[PDB]
Amino acid sequence: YEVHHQKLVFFAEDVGSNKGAIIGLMVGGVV
Amino acid sequence: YEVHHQKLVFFAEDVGSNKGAIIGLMVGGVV
Amino acid sequence: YEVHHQKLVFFAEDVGSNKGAIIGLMVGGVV
Amino acid sequence: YEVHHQKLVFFAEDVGSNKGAIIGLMVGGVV
Amino acid sequence: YEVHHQKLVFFAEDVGSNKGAIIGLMVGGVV
Amino acid sequence: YEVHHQKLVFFAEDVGSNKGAIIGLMVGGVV
Amino acid sequence: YEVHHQKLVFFAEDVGSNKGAIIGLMVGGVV
Amino acid sequence: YEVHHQKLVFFAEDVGSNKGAIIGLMVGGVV
Amino acid sequence: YEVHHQKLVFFAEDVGSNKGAIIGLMVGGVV
Amino acid sequence: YEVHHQKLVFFAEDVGSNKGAIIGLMVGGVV
């Protein structure tokens, strides 16, 4: 898994109640 | 998995209750 | 898992009650 | 797990009561 | 787990009562 | 407005984020 | 507004973040 | 506003962050 | 505003951070 | 505002940080 040179902007203003995953970036795995 | 040079903008203003996944970027895996 | 040169900005202004994961960046694993 | 050269900014202004994980960055593991 | 050259800024202004984990950075482990 | 002898049962198990009104009973008015 | 003899049961188990009104009973008014 | 003989049961088990009104009973007014 | 003979039971087990009103009973007014 | 003969039970077990009003009973006014 070669992952590089990633300019990332993430906005999540108002979240009532997250019942799961909020991932800005995932290179791998299990969710 | 060669992943590079990614300019990403993500907006999620109001989220009541997320019952799953909110992924800005996923190079691989299981969700 | 080769992960490098990542300029990341993450905003989560108001969160009532998170019942899961809020990950700015995950290189791997289980969530 | 080779993880380097990561310029990261994380904002979480108001959080009522977090019932899970708020991770700025995770190189691996279980959550 | 090779983790280096990480410039990290973390903000958590007001937190009512955290019932979990608030991690600025996790190189590994169990949470 | 004569309203009487009302046996009422109301269930609302999981509500993500209510953006309006959840009224078990309204005898009148404006909503 | 004559309102009487009202046996009422109200359940709201899990609410992420209410952005409005949750009224078990309203005899009148403005909401 | 004649309001009487009201046997009321109200349950609100888990509330992340209420951004409005949770009223068991309102005889009148403005909300 | 005639309000009488009100047997009321109110439960609010866990509340992360209330950003509004939690009223067991309101005979009138402004909220 | 005639308010009488009110048998009231109120439970609020765990409250992280209340940012508003928790009123068992309000006969009137401004909140």
Coordinates of C-alpha atoms in Angstrom, one line a residue:
Chain A
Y1 CA 0.0 0.0 0.0
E2 CA 1.9 3.0 -1.3
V3 CA 0.1 6.1 -0.4
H4 CA 1.7 9.6 -0.7
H5 CA 1.4 13.2 -1.7
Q6 CA -2.1 13.8 -0.4
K7 CA -3.4 17.3 0.3
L8 CA -6.7 16.8 2.1
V9 CA -9.2 19.2 3.5
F10 CA -12.1 17.8 5.6
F11 CA -15.1 19.6 7.0
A12 CA -17.8 18.2 9.3
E13 CA -19.5 21.1 10.9
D14 CA -22.4 19.9 13.1
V15 CA -22.8 16.2 13.9
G16 CA -25.7 15.2 16.2
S17 CA -24.5 11.7 17.3
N18 CA -22.3 9.6 15.0
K19 CA -23.2 5.9 15.2
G20 CA -20.4 4.8 12.8
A21 CA -17.2 6.0 11.3
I22 CA -16.1 9.4 10.1
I23 CA -12.8 8.9 8.4
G24 CA -10.9 11.6 6.7
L25 CA -8.6 9.1 5.0
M26 CA -8.2 5.3 5.3
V27 CA -5.2 3.5 3.6
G28 CA -6.6 0.1 4.5
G29 CA -8.1 -2.2 7.2
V30 CA -11.5 -3.1 8.5
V31 CA -14.3 -0.7 9.5
Chain B
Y1 CA -2.1 0.1 -4.6
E2 CA -0.3 3.2 -5.9
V3 CA -2.3 6.2 -4.9
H4 CA -0.9 9.8 -5.1
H5 CA -1.3 13.4 -6.0
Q6 CA -4.9 13.8 -4.7
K7 CA -6.2 17.2 -4.0
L8 CA -9.5 16.5 -2.1
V9 CA -12.1 18.8 -0.5
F10 CA -14.9 17.2 1.6
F11 CA -18.0 18.9 3.1
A12 CA -20.5 17.3 5.4
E13 CA -22.3 20.1 7.1
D14 CA -25.1 18.7 9.3
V15 CA -25.3 15.0 10.1
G16 CA -28.1 13.8 12.4
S17 CA -26.8 10.4 13.3
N18 CA -24.5 8.4 11.0
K19 CA -25.2 4.7 11.2
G20 CA -22.5 3.7 8.7
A21 CA -19.3 5.1 7.1
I22 CA -18.4 8.6 6.0
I23 CA -15.1 8.2 4.2
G24 CA -13.3 11.1 2.5
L25 CA -11.0 8.7 0.8
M26 CA -10.4 4.9 0.9
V27 CA -7.4 3.3 -0.8
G28 CA -8.6 -0.1 0.1
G29 CA -9.9 -2.5 2.7
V30 CA -13.3 -3.6 4.0
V31 CA -16.1 -1.4 5.2
Chain C
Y1 CA 2.0 0.3 4.4
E2 CA 4.1 3.2 3.1
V3 CA 2.3 6.4 4.0
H4 CA 4.0 9.8 3.7
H5 CA 3.8 13.4 2.7
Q6 CA 0.2 14.1 3.8
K7 CA -0.9 17.6 4.5
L8 CA -4.2 17.2 6.3
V9 CA -6.8 19.7 7.7
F10 CA -9.7 18.4 9.7
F11 CA -12.7 20.3 11.1
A12 CA -15.4 18.9 13.4
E13 CA -17.1 22.0 14.9
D14 CA -20.0 20.8 17.1
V15 CA -20.5 17.1 18.0
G16 CA -23.4 16.2 20.2
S17 CA -22.4 12.7 21.3
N18 CA -20.2 10.5 19.1
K19 CA -21.2 6.9 19.3
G20 CA -18.4 5.7 17.0
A21 CA -15.1 6.7 15.5
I22 CA -14.0 10.2 14.3
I23 CA -10.6 9.5 12.6
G24 CA -8.6 12.2 10.9
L25 CA -6.4 9.6 9.3
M26 CA -6.0 5.8 9.6
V27 CA -3.1 3.9 8.0
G28 CA -4.6 0.6 8.9
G29 CA -6.2 -1.6 11.5
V30 CA -9.6 -2.5 12.8
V31 CA -12.3 0.0 13.8
Chain D
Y1 CA 4.0 0.4 8.8
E2 CA 6.1 3.3 7.4
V3 CA 4.4 6.5 8.3
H4 CA 6.2 9.9 8.0
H5 CA 6.1 13.5 6.9
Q6 CA 2.6 14.3 8.0
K7 CA 1.5 17.9 8.6
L8 CA -1.8 17.5 10.4
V9 CA -4.3 20.1 11.7
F10 CA -7.3 18.9 13.8
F11 CA -10.2 20.9 15.1
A12 CA -13.0 19.7 17.4
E13 CA -14.5 22.8 18.9
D14 CA -17.5 21.7 21.1
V15 CA -18.1 18.0 22.0
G16 CA -21.1 17.3 24.3
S17 CA -20.1 13.8 25.4
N18 CA -18.0 11.5 23.2
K19 CA -19.1 7.9 23.5
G20 CA -16.3 6.6 21.2
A21 CA -13.0 7.5 19.7
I22 CA -11.8 10.9 18.4
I23 CA -8.4 10.1 16.8
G24 CA -6.4 12.7 15.0
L25 CA -4.2 10.0 13.5
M26 CA -3.9 6.2 13.8
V27 CA -1.1 4.3 12.3
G28 CA -2.7 1.0 13.3
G29 CA -4.3 -1.1 15.9
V30 CA -7.8 -1.9 17.2
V31 CA -10.4 0.7 18.1
Chain E
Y1 CA 6.2 0.8 13.3
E2 CA 8.3 3.6 11.9
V3 CA 6.6 6.8 12.7
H4 CA 8.4 10.2 12.3
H5 CA 8.4 13.8 11.1
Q6 CA 4.8 14.6 12.3
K7 CA 3.8 18.2 12.8
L8 CA 0.5 17.9 14.6
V9 CA -2.0 20.6 15.9
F10 CA -5.0 19.4 17.9
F11 CA -7.9 21.5 19.2
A12 CA -10.7 20.3 21.5
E13 CA -12.2 23.5 23.0
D14 CA -15.2 22.4 25.2
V15 CA -15.8 18.8 26.2
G16 CA -18.8 18.1 28.5
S17 CA -17.8 14.7 29.7
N18 CA -15.7 12.3 27.5
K19 CA -16.9 8.7 27.9
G20 CA -14.1 7.3 25.6
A21 CA -10.8 8.2 24.1
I22 CA -9.5 11.6 22.7
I23 CA -6.2 10.7 21.1
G24 CA -4.1 13.3 19.3
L25 CA -2.0 10.5 17.8
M26 CA -1.7 6.7 18.2
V27 CA 1.1 4.7 16.7
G28 CA -0.5 1.5 17.8
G29 CA -2.1 -0.6 20.5
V30 CA -5.6 -1.3 21.7
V31 CA -8.3 1.3 22.7
Chain F
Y1 CA -61.9 22.4 22.7
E2 CA -63.3 19.6 24.8
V3 CA -60.8 16.8 24.9
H4 CA -61.0 14.0 27.5
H5 CA -60.7 10.3 28.2
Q6 CA -57.6 9.6 26.1
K7 CA -55.5 6.5 26.8
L8 CA -52.4 7.1 24.7
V9 CA -49.2 5.1 24.1
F10 CA -46.3 6.7 22.2
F11 CA -43.1 5.0 21.1
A12 CA -40.1 6.7 19.3
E13 CA -37.2 4.4 19.8
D14 CA -34.2 5.9 18.0
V15 CA -34.2 9.5 16.5
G16 CA -31.0 10.7 14.9
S17 CA -31.7 14.4 14.9
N18 CA -35.3 15.8 14.9
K19 CA -35.6 19.0 12.8
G20 CA -39.3 19.6 13.6
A21 CA -42.0 18.5 16.0
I22 CA -42.6 15.1 17.7
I23 CA -46.0 15.6 19.5
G24 CA -47.7 12.8 21.3
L25 CA -50.9 14.8 21.4
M26 CA -51.9 18.4 20.4
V27 CA -55.3 19.8 21.4
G28 CA -54.6 22.9 19.4
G29 CA -52.3 25.8 18.5
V30 CA -49.6 26.4 15.9
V31 CA -46.7 24.2 15.0
Chain G
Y1 CA -59.5 24.6 26.4
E2 CA -60.9 21.8 28.5
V3 CA -58.4 19.0 28.7
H4 CA -58.8 16.2 31.3
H5 CA -58.6 12.5 32.1
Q6 CA -55.5 11.7 30.0
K7 CA -53.5 8.6 30.7
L8 CA -50.3 9.1 28.6
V9 CA -47.2 7.0 28.2
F10 CA -44.3 8.4 26.2
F11 CA -41.1 6.6 25.1
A12 CA -38.1 8.3 23.4
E13 CA -35.2 5.9 23.9
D14 CA -32.1 7.3 22.1
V15 CA -32.0 10.8 20.6
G16 CA -28.8 11.9 18.9
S17 CA -29.4 15.7 18.9
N18 CA -32.9 17.1 18.9
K19 CA -33.1 20.3 16.7
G20 CA -36.8 21.0 17.5
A21 CA -39.6 20.0 19.9
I22 CA -40.3 16.7 21.6
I23 CA -43.7 17.3 23.4
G24 CA -45.5 14.5 25.2
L25 CA -48.6 16.7 25.3
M26 CA -49.5 20.2 24.3
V27 CA -52.9 21.8 25.2
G28 CA -52.1 24.9 23.1
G29 CA -49.7 27.6 22.2
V30 CA -47.0 28.2 19.6
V31 CA -44.1 25.9 18.8
Chain H
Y1 CA -56.9 26.8 30.0
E2 CA -58.5 24.1 32.2
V3 CA -56.1 21.2 32.4
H4 CA -56.5 18.4 35.0
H5 CA -56.4 14.7 35.9
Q6 CA -53.4 13.8 33.8
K7 CA -51.5 10.7 34.6
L8 CA -48.3 11.0 32.6
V9 CA -45.2 8.8 32.1
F10 CA -42.2 10.1 30.2
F11 CA -39.0 8.3 29.2
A12 CA -36.0 9.8 27.4
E13 CA -33.2 7.3 28.0
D14 CA -30.1 8.6 26.2
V15 CA -29.9 12.1 24.6
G16 CA -26.7 13.1 23.0
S17 CA -27.1 16.9 22.9
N18 CA -30.6 18.4 22.8
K19 CA -30.7 21.6 20.6
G20 CA -34.3 22.3 21.3
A21 CA -37.2 21.5 23.7
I22 CA -38.0 18.2 25.5
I23 CA -41.3 18.9 27.2
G24 CA -43.3 16.3 29.1
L25 CA -46.3 18.5 29.1
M26 CA -47.1 22.1 28.0
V27 CA -50.4 23.7 28.9
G28 CA -49.6 26.7 26.7
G29 CA -47.1 29.4 25.8
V30 CA -44.4 29.9 23.2
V31 CA -41.5 27.5 22.5
Chain I
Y1 CA -54.4 28.9 33.6
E2 CA -56.1 26.2 35.8
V3 CA -53.7 23.3 36.1
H4 CA -54.3 20.6 38.7
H5 CA -54.3 16.9 39.6
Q6 CA -51.2 15.9 37.6
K7 CA -49.4 12.7 38.5
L8 CA -46.2 12.9 36.5
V9 CA -43.2 10.7 36.1
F10 CA -40.2 11.9 34.1
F11 CA -37.0 9.9 33.2
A12 CA -33.9 11.3 31.4
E13 CA -31.2 8.8 32.1
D14 CA -28.0 10.0 30.2
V15 CA -27.7 13.4 28.7
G16 CA -24.4 14.3 27.0
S17 CA -24.8 18.1 26.9
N18 CA -28.3 19.8 26.7
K19 CA -28.2 22.9 24.5
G20 CA -31.9 23.8 25.2
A21 CA -34.7 23.0 27.6
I22 CA -35.7 19.8 29.4
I23 CA -39.0 20.6 31.0
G24 CA -41.0 18.0 32.9
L25 CA -44.0 20.3 32.9
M26 CA -44.7 23.9 31.8
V27 CA -48.0 25.7 32.6
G28 CA -47.0 28.6 30.4
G29 CA -44.5 31.2 29.5
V30 CA -41.7 31.6 26.9
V31 CA -38.9 29.1 26.2
Chain J
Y1 CA -52.0 31.1 36.7
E2 CA -53.8 28.6 38.9
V3 CA -51.6 25.6 39.4
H4 CA -52.2 23.0 42.1
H5 CA -52.4 19.3 43.0
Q6 CA -49.3 18.2 41.1
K7 CA -47.6 15.0 42.1
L8 CA -44.3 15.1 40.2
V9 CA -41.3 12.7 40.0
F10 CA -38.2 13.8 38.1
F11 CA -35.1 11.8 37.2
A12 CA -31.9 13.0 35.6
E13 CA -29.3 10.5 36.4
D14 CA -26.1 11.5 34.6
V15 CA -25.6 14.9 32.9
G16 CA -22.3 15.7 31.4
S17 CA -22.5 19.5 31.1
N18 CA -25.9 21.2 30.8
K19 CA -25.7 24.3 28.5
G20 CA -29.4 25.3 29.1
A21 CA -32.3 24.7 31.4
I22 CA -33.4 21.5 33.2
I23 CA -36.8 22.5 34.8
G24 CA -38.9 20.0 36.7
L25 CA -41.9 22.3 36.5
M26 CA -42.4 25.9 35.3
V27 CA -45.7 27.7 36.0
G28 CA -44.6 30.6 33.8
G29 CA -41.9 33.1 32.8
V30 CA -39.1 33.4 30.4
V31 CA -36.3 30.8 29.8

